[PDB]
């Protein structure tokens, strides 16, 4: 069992790093950048109607 545990721990240590370092900042950058562009289209329209 002991040899079997050693083989599994390595797959498991890899995953804990993988999520934090890659995934979480990829989600952050995508969401915020699209949020910012999306609000811009809406704001300029108001200014053009007003003008």
């Amino acid at each position: 069992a002991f040899i079997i545990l050693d083989e599994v721990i390595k797959v498991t240590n890899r995953r804990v790093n993988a999520i934090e370092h890659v995934i979480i900042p990829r989600t952050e950058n995508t969401i915020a950048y699209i949020n910012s562009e999306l609000d811009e289209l809406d704001r300029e329209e108001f200014y053009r109607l007003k003008k």
């Binding site: 240590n13 890899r14 790093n17 890659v22």
Partner: peptide
């Protein structure tokens, strides 16, 4: 450097 954090030296 990014790969060292993920994969390890393994």
């Amino acid at each position: 450097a990014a790969m060292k954090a993920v994969v390890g030296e393994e």
